[PDB]
Design a protein around this ligand. Structure first.
Ligand SMILES: O=C(O)c1ccc(C(=O)O)c(O)c1
Ligand SMILES: O=C(O)c1ccc(C(=O)O)c(O)c1
Ligand SMILES: O=C(O)c1ccc(C(=O)O)c(O)c1
Ligand code: FES
Ligand code: FES
Ligand code: FES
Ligand SMILES: [Fe+3]
Ligand SMILES: [Fe+3]
Lengths: 154, 129, 403, 389, 154, 154, 381
C-alpha cells in the first residue's frame, strides 16, 4: 500500500530540493511522461487547462530549470515550503491519488518574507523500481494572484 | 501484550535498566512480575481516585496524567495511556524518574513485598542477555 | 518644487515625479480613467447568457458588466446610490437584478434604481419625502462598445467611437487575432510592485523586447516594426518572416507551432490606452488588463485564449506555448520585475528625467524595433488627457521673440 | 473642489471625502477625541482593586486608567514627560507606581512625575539644572466620570458632567441594563477595514437592522413593523434603537428568559464618539470603537453576564452570544458592510451620501424606517468639528 | 488506545473538510453532546467562558453551517489550515486530551492572503463504534483580534 | 535507529516549550556541552561563525533565560512554531544529524501576527538516559532581518 | 507647524520632527545628499579589484566598488536611461556594471560606456547624432576611507573625512581600527521608529545604565565634536557560565567600553572584546534599518575569536544590552501619537552641546540636534 507516511517523506525531499535551489534534481521526482501544472482554484473549479507552468514530460521540466539558470532575469529570492499531512483518495501497492496542503514563503535577498502561495498538490503517484514517483502534480493555488513573478516552481 | 520473562529482561536491558540507580536487571523483571504479571495493559483503580497503569503499575496522582485524577502532578510529563502501550519505552523512562526520586524501588509496593532482598537474579537466568 | 514639471513639448524627457506624485494619481482617475478613454472590461463570451455579470474596475472605480435579455451588454459603477456600498459582491454570477445588501435598494441590469426598501415608510411613519424620486439616483452608467468580442466602457458620452479611438490599423490588427470565436483557457493575476505607467510603457517598449528576442535567438530571418495610432495611445509591435524567401531544448515541442494566420507574423503585441493588451506569440493568444492599485502598485489580469475550433493537438500546442507568457513566462517573467527596478532606482531622483530618445523625438510608426516611438506616443496621449501640454506662461517664455 | 465641503445646513447629504481626507482625520483627533467629549475607557469592575490598571486609547492617544487606594479611578496619557515613551507597556496589571523603562522616571497613579533618575547628577556631575521642577512636567491628565460602572475620560475642562453630556433619557436607558453588578465573560477585538465613522453610523442605522440581517427578519427579532422607536439626545451624538416582540435543528440558540420590566427584547445605545451598550434578548455587551488609520478602526467587545446569573441563565447568554461579535449571526455582517462602503466610494470622493429616510429630522421617532439617529451623529460631528453650514 | 497517528489523520480530514467548503461534513467530526468554542489566550488564561463561536451540541454546529450557506452576508473567502503534530496531554484505556498547533490563512476571492488565526486546538477525543470523535474542541487563538469577521469555523 | 517520527516528536515538544513561555525548560532539550546558534543563510553560506544567540554550554542557555526573566525589557509577545518533517543525513541508535524546516509567527499582546522567522534547524542529536537531546542546533534563518528585536530563542 | 522649534537651544525638540513627511523629504535633500559622509562598507568587504556591494545613502541606492588602481568608487544605483537599478546583487565581483533592462553598460566609476543598439539595428532606429554617452550617468559620490571605513557624499563642498570627524573622533576610531578587521557575521534589525530616535538612543549616555539592567567603581565621559553630530561615550577602571564576560587585554588604555557615532548614521562599538560597526538607514517616516557588521581582527587566535563570539551575546537583535535599544524608539513613536504639537525635554547636563566628564548628561543628544538644525536650516539665533 502507498501510505501517508511514504508520501509525507517524498514531499519533504521534494520541498528540500526546491527550497535548497538544487533545482537540477527537481525533474527526477517525476516520471518521463509526467504532467506538472501550476494553476488556481478558479481555473480548477471551471475546468480550465492552462498553467503558469504546464509540462507533459520530464524533459519540459529540465528545460524550465535550464532557462531558470541561463536565460531568466529575476531578483534573488528563496522559497520555504511548509506542508501539511497528505490525504489519499484512492490507490493500491503501486498507484495512488492524493492531496497535500502547502504554503510557500518567499524570502527576498533583501530580507522581506511574504506568503507567496498556498493550496494543495493534487497528485498521482506511481512506483518505479520500488520508489515513489509523481506521474502528475497539479499545484492548485488558493489565490489567483502571483506577487511580481514566479521563477521557481511550487 | 503479555511479555515472556526473558523477552522482558532483554527489553529492559536494552533500555539501560541493568544496575540503574544501583538496581540489577532482575529487580526490574521481578518488579514487573508482581506489579503487572508482565501485562502492558494492566490497570488497577485505587480508592483515592488514582489508577496504576501498565507493566510497572505507575500511579496517576504523582507520575502520569489520566485526566480523571484530582491533584495530578504528572511528574513524568506523559499521558498514562502512553504507559499502556506494547512498547515499554514510556514506562521505562518514567520508572527511571521514579527510581531517582530518593525512595529508590520502594515506590513499587509489590517489588517491596515480593522482590526486595530476595535472589532477584533468578528472574534473569535461562535468558539470552 | 513640482516633481511633475515637463521639460518641453517633446516626450524625450519624462519627469520621474510622474511615478510617485499622489495628487497627479488622483488627476489620472478624473482625467484618464473617468475621462475620454475606453476601459477594457471583459470578453462578451465570458458573459454569454442573459443575467451573466462580472465585476472589474475602470481605474480605481469598481464596475459591473452584465448581459441583458436583449443580448446587449451594459456596464455601471458598482456603487449604491444610497450610502455608497458595493452593489455586486461576487467576481461573477447570474442575476435578474442587483440588490444592495445594506438597505436592500434594487438596480436593474442597466444600473437604474428600481426599488428603495420602505421608500413609503411603515404605517404612515418615516420613509422618503414626497420630493424623493428613484429615477434621480443611480450609479454612473458607462457607454459600452463591443469590438471583436472585446467589451470596453467609458464614463464619457463624448469619447470618440471605439473605431475612431483605435484607428483603422489597430482595428485590422485586433480583427487579425480575434477573427473567429475564442474560449478562455485560463485566468492568472500578477500584482506588480510599480506604478501602472511603468508596466504600460514596458508593453510599448520595442527596445527592451527586441533586445530580449535577440538574446533568445542564441538558442529564420525576421523583420519588425512599430505602429502608433494618431493619438500616440495605442501601438503594435510585430516580428515577421517573408513567406517564400529562400534560405539546447530537451523537449523542442515547447516551440513547435502551426501556421494559422494568412501572413508571416510570428509575434504581434498590441496596446490600447490606458491598459488593454492583445498578444499573439506564435500560437500563444492572450488578453491583458492593467489596473492601477496604489501609487507604487498595479495589477495585471491575464486571460489566456484558444479558438473554439481548436483540435486536441492545436489546444495542447497553446498549453505548451503558454510557458512563454504570464507570471512564469520564458519571455514575460522579467516584465513583472523591470518596472519595480525603475520604481526603486528613482527613489532619490524624484526631480530628474527619464531619457527616451531611441528613434529620435518621433511618435509615429517605424520600420525596425530599436526605437522608443511607441513609449513617446504613450506620453503624447497621456499629456493630452491630463492637460500637461505646454500652455500659458511656459509657452509664452519660449515664444515671446521676433526672429 | 474640497472633498469635505458640506452641501447645506441639514445632514441629508454627507460628503464621501469625510471618510478619506487625512487632514480632516487629524482635526477629528484635536476637536473630537481631545475635545468636548467623554471617551469610554473600561468598566470599574475590570480594575476593582487598588493599583489595578488597564491601557487603552482615546482616539489615537494611548491612556492609562487605574484604581487608587481611595477607591477612585484616575486616567492619564500614556506618554512619559521626558522624551515621550509609553510609560505602561502592559494591557493590564497591578502596580504601586508607573515607571518609564527608558530613563526610569516614576509617576504616581494620578500621572504626577514623582522621580527623575540622577536628577541631582552622579558624584556631583550632570543632572538637571536648578531651574528644573518635576511638578512642571507630566502627561496630560483626564477628567474621569463613572456612570453605572462605565469609566469615561475627557481631555476637556469644559465638557459637561457625564450625566448632562448623556442627557436624562440615555442615563435611564443605561441604568435599565446596568441595574446590578456585571461580570466580564469574554473579550474579543474585531479589526474593521473602514473609517471609524462608517461603523458608528452603522450602529445608529435603525433602517438597516432588518434589511442587512436575515436573522432579525426571518426569526421576527427586530422587524420595522414591531413596536419600538429611535431616541436621539438633544446634541444628536447619542441614540437608542429599541424593539419589542430557513429553520434551526437547535432552537436553544434563541431560547431566552424574561429579565427586563418593560417588554423590550432589543436595546442598542450609542454615546458619541465610540461607546455602544447592547441588549439583544439576554445577550449583554459593551463595545468600544477606536480610529486606527483613515480606512481602519478597532471594535473592542466586552461580553457581560450579571454576577447573580444561575448556571442556566449564564449558559443562555453564552449561547445567544453566537448572535454578536466577529462571528455573530447578526454582527458578522456589521463588520463587513463598512468596508463595502469604503470600497464602493473609491471613485466617488467628490459625491455625497443620501440620508433622507424620516426627512431632515434629527429628533426621536416612533418607528425605525428613519435615518434620524444617523443625521444626529453628523449634527454632533459638525458642531465639534466647526463644519456647521 | 487513541494515539498521535490516529489524531494526526483525524486533524488532516477535519482541515480538508473546512478548507474544501464541504462544511456540511464538519459536524460529523463531533459527538452528539460535544463542545466547540473559538476563544483566545487572554480569555483562556483568565478562565472566561464566552466564544465568538460557542456550541454545546452537534445540532448547533449544523445550524452554523446552514446560516453560512443560506443566511449570512460575507465576502467570499477560503481557509488554508497548516497543522502541527498533536501532543497527547492525558489519557487512559479509552479517552484522550490533546493539543494541536494550528495556523489558518484566509484567501479572499480577490486574491489577498493573510495569516487569519493561529493557536492550538485543546481537544477531548473518544472512539465510538470505530470512529474517532471530538467530545470537545476549544480553538485557543494566539491573537485577541479577528480581521473583519469570522464566517468559517476554525 | 533514530527516525523522522522520533525527531518530529522531539521538535514538537521543543516548540511547545518555547511557544508556551515555559522558557525555564528550554535548556533541558540540550546536552551540558551543547552548541546553539541563531544565524542566517548569508552567514552560513560564507562560513561566518557569529550568532544573534551563541552558546557552547547548557549553562549559557540557562543564563539567557535568567536574563530574559529578571533583566531584559521587551513588549509582551508569543511565538507559534510550525515545523516541517525532518530529513536525516546520518546516525544510528544513539546519534543523528538532521535538518528540520521551521516557520515562527510572532503574535504581539496587542494582536498583530507576523511571520517573524523561517529557515531550518541543522541539528546533531545524541541519546542521554534513553531520551533524544540536542548536542547542536543551528537555527539558519532564511532572512537577514529580525523585526524590532529577538527576546525568545527559536 | 508641528516642526516649530521652541528656541535657539536644543533642550526642547518638537515631536512633529518624527512624523512630518515633507520634513523627511528635506532630510534626504539636506542631510543624506548634503554636506555629510554616509557610511557605505568596510575596505575588507571589497578587498580586490571588481569587488562591490550595494547599499543606501539615506533613501538613495548606491554601488561601492574597488577598481584596479586599489581606489574605491561609489555612484547612485540608477541607470541614466529610464532609472532602473543597475546592480541587483548585495555583493559580487565584476569588470563592468550592466543595467538588465536595455543593456546600458557602466565602468566602476559610474561612467556610461555602452548603449545597446546605439547606432540602430540594420541601419534603422538608434540614438540621434546629438546623443553623447559622456553626457549621461548616475550621480557619482565622493569616497573617503578612514582606518578601513568607506564613506560617500553627494556634496562637492563636504570637508575631508578628517576635518568632518575632527581630531578626537579620528583618534577614538584609530584606537579600535588600528589593524585589519574581518567580518564574523551580518544581521539587520528593522526598527519600528523614525531613524532619528535610534541615532539619539546611541548618543544617550543617560539611558545606558537605566534601560539596560544587565550588569546591575569606574569612571566615564562623553566627547562631542565641534559640529555636535559625532560623539563618544566611554567607560574605564549569579551567571552559571561566567565565560560570557571573560575577556582579554588588547587596548593600551584601560577603556572597557567605547561607543562612537558619526552623523548621520554610523556607529563603531567596542564593549570589552565585542567589536562591531552599525549602519542606520531611514526607510519610511516611522521605520528604519539597522545593519550590524560584527568584527574580529584578522590576527585573532582561535581562543580570542571564541571570546568575541561569546561576548556577541551582549549586542545585536537579542543582545543582553542592545535588545531593548531595538524597542525603545518604538515606545517613543507610539507614546507621542497624540502629541505631534508637544516637545521632548532634553535638559540633563544643562543646555551644553560639548564634552563632559560623567554620563548623567544628554549633551551628545543635544549635539545631534545642533548638527541636524544646521544642515536642515532650522537654527534660531
Ligand atoms: O516584440 C515586442 O515589441 C514585444 C513587446 C512587448 C511584449 C510583452 O509581452 O509585453 C512582447 O512579448 C513583445
Ligand atoms: O435595530 C437597530 O436599530 C439596531 C442597530 C444596531 C444593532 C447592532 O447590533 O449594532 C442592532 O442589533 C440593532
Ligand atoms: O554607555 C553609553 O553611553 C552607551 C550608549 C549606547 C550603547 C549602544 O550599544 O547602543 C552602549 O553600549 C553604551
Ligand atoms: S448603501 Fe445600498 S441600500 Fe443602503
Ligand atoms: S522617555 Fe521616559 S524616562 Fe526618558
Ligand atoms: S533603464 Fe537601464 S538600460 Fe534602460
Ligand atoms: Fe446591525
Ligand atoms: Fe544602549
Amino acid at each position: 500500500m502507498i501510505n501517508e507516511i511514504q508520501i509525507a517523506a517524498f514531499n519533504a525531499a521534494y520541498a528540500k530540493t526546491v527550497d535548497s535551489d538544487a533545482m537540477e534534481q527537481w525533474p527526477t521526482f517525476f516520471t518521463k511522461d509526467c504532467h506538472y501544472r501550476v494553476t488556481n482554484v478558479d481555473n480548477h473549479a471551471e475546468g480550465l487547462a492552462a498553467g503558469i507552468v504546464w509540462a507533459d514530460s520530464q524533459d519540459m521540466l529540465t528545460d524550465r530549470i535550464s532557462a531558470l539558470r541561463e536565460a531568466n532575469i529575476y531578483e534573488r529570492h528563496r522559497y520555504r515550503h511548509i506542508l501539511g499531512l497528505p490525504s489519499i483518495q484512492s490507490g493500491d501497492a503501486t498507484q495512488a491519488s492524493a492531496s497535500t496542503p502547502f504554503m510557500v514563503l518567499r524570502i527576498m535577498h533583501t530580507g522581506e518574507t511574504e506568503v507567496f502561495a498556498s493550496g494543495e498538490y493534487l497528485d498521482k503517484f506511481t512506483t518505479i523500481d520500488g520508489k515513489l514517483r509523481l506521474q502528475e502534480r497539479i499545484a492548485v493555488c488558493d489565490s489567483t494572484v502571483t506577487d511580481t513573478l514566479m521563477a521557481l516552481p511550487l | 501484550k503479555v511479555f515472556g520473562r526473558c523477552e522482558l529482561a532483554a527489553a529492559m536491558k536494552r533500555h539501560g535498566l541493568d544496575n540503574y540507580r544501583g538496581y540489577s536487571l532482575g529487580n526490574w523483571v521481578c518488579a514487573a512480575k508482581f506489579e503487572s504479571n508482565f501485562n502492558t495493559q494492566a490497570t488497577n483503580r485505587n480508592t483515592d481516585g488514582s489508577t496504576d497503569y501498565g507493566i510497572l503499575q505507575i500511579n496517576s496522582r504523582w507520575w502520569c496524567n489520566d485526566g480523571r485524577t484530582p491533584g495530578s502532578r504528572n511528574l513524568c510529563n506523559i499521558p498514562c495511556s502512553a504507559l499502556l502501550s506494547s512498547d515499554i519505552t514510556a514506562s521505562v523512562n518514567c520508572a527511571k524518574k521514579i527510581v531517582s526520586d530518593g525512595n529508590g524501588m520502594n515506590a513499587w509496593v509489590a517489588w517491596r513485598n515480593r522482590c526486595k532482598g530476595t535472589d532477584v537474579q533468578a528472574w534473569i537466568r535461562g535468558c539470552r542477555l | 518644487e513640482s516633481i511633475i514639471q515637463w521639460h518641453g513639448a517633446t516626450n524625450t524627457r519624462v519627469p520621474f515625479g510622474i511615478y510617485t506624485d499622489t495628487a497627479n494619481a488622483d488627476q489620472e482617475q478624473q482625467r484618464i480613467y473617468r475621462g475620454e478613454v475606453w476601459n477594457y472590461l471583459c470578453l462578451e463570451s465570458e458573459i454569454p447568457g442573459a443575467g451573466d455579470f462580472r465585476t472589474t474596475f475602470a481605474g480605481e472605480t469598481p464596475i459591473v458588466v452584465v448581459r441583458d435579455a436583449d443580448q446587449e451588454i451594459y456596464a455601471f459603477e458598482n456603487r449604491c446610490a444610497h450610502r455608497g456600498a458595493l452593489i455586486a459582491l461576487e467576481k461573477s454570477g447570474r442575476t435578474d437584478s442587483f440588490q444592495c445588501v445594506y438597505h436592500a435598494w434594487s438596480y436593474n441590469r442597466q444600473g437604474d434604481l428600481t426599488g428603495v426598501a420602505f421608500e413609503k415608510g411603515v404605517k404612515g411613519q418615516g420613509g422618503m419625502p414626497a420630493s424623493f424620486c428613484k429615477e434621480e439616483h443611480g450609479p454612473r452608467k458607462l457607454r459600452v462598445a463591443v469590438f471583436c468580442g472585446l467589451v470596453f466602457g467609458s464614463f464619457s458620452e463624448d469619447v470618440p467611437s471605439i473605431e475612431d479611438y483605435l484607428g483603422p490599423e489597430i482595428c485590422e490588427r485586433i480583427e487579425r487575432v480575434l477573427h473567429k470565436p475564442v474560449e478562455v483557457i485560463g485566468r492568472f493575476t500578477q500584482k506588480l510592485p510599480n506604478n501602472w505607467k511603468l508596466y504600460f510603457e514596458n508593453v510599448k517598449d520595442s527596445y527592451h523586447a527586441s533586445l530580449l528576442h535577440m538574446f533568445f535567438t542564441t538558442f529564420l530571418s525576421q523583420k519588425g516594426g512599430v505602429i502608433v495610432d494618431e493619438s500616440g495611445g495605442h501601438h503594435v509591435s510585430y516580428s515577421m518572416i517573408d513567406r517564400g524567401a529562400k534560405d539546447r531544448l530537451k523537449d523542442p515541442s515547447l516551440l513547435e507551432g502551426f501556421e494559422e494566420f494568412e501572413d508571416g507574423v510570428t509575434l504581434q503585441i498590441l496596446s490600447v490606452f490606458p491598459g488593454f493588451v492583445l498578444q499573439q506569440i506564435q500560437n500563444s493568444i492572450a488578453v491583458r488588463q492593467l489596473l492601477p492599485k496604489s501609487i507604487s502598485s498595479s495589477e495585471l489580469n491575464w486571460t489566456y485564449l484558444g479558438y473554439a475550433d481548436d483540435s486536441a493537438e492545436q489546444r495542447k500546442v497553446r498549453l505548451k506555448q503558454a510557458n512563454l507568457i504570464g507570471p512564469a513566462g520564458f519571455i514575460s517573467m522579467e516584465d513583472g520585475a523591470v518596472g519595480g527596478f525603475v520604481q526603486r532606482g528613482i527613489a532619490g531622483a524624484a526631480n530628474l528625467d527619464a531619457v527616451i530618445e531611441m528613434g529620435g523625438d518621433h511618435e509615429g510608426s517605424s520600420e525596425g524595433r530599436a526605437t522608443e516611438t511607441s513609449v513617446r506616443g504613450f506620453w503624447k496621449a497621456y499629456r493630452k488627457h491630463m492637460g500637461q501640454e505646454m500652455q500659458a506662461e511656459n509657452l509664452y517664455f519660449q515664444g515671446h521673440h521676433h526672429h
